[PDB]
Design a protein around this ligand. Sequence first.
Ligand code: CLF
Ligand code: SF4
Ligand SMILES: [S]
Length: 279
Amino acid sequence: TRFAHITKAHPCFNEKLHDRVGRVHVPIAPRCNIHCKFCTRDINECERRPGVTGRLMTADDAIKHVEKVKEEMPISVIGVAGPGDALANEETFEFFKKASKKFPDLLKCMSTNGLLLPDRADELAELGINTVTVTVNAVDPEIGEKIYSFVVYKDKVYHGREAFEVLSRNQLEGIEKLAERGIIVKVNSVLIPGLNDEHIVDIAREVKKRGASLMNIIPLIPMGEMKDYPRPTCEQIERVRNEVEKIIPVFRACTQCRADAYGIPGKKEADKHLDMTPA
Ligand code: CLF
Ligand code: SF4
Ligand SMILES: [S]
């Protein structure tokens, strides 16, 4: 059963552990293959948005960082949320091989946008990765085209609906590939008011078919091209959570943490900027 695989000792699965057990994000994945109309990807030591990091690390330096934080804080997960996409940077794999031997105790976890899941799902299973998160914001191309601008696949660029149809085929087939390989898939969905508002439930039924075990509906952080957009009301994100919960289990404590965040997602720290700022 796919249910016997999904268990909770990870804080981003089961909210009763979120403010209890740690996790570490290594900022080792800077490049990205797609363009989300709400992504901004930055480098600073303040904002808490997911595409933010204080400094990028090398795979070997990330090992030393995990080792150092393990001793000082209570860690249980190692995740590559990385500025861009964790499947699009070979250093994520380079790290996951090194961490498979150096840290056999902490469970491995990583975030992706599915586009490279068909090509790299085989590798993921070989690295002993436990959970992977896929960011699915739409299934209907009429919705999806309004969310993504460009997609890079097979050394070529895609635009509009053509770009979305490549992404949708890869993410959904990527969930089903991962589910078969034994990897527990989580699906993050950003609730964009006016766009996928009345579409989130359709997404939940599609990802359930593909084998996704949990769904994390998160409100939009109006950034990128959608800076003018409104952050959905908390009363509205609970309305979609209560109907989606009837189909697939729902995570309710996502704090949209940055790609360098280490520590318990109740009292976590971030990587300091890097000394190169005088005038
Ligand atoms: S890749 Fe993996 S599942 Fe993602 S955070 Fe990182 S360890 Fe966890 Fe956690 S609170 Fe929400 S769901 Fe994330 S944005 Fe952070
Ligand atoms: S997957 Fe992340 S890095 Fe890539 S476009 Fe979307 S928000 Fe930006
Ligand atoms: S995540």
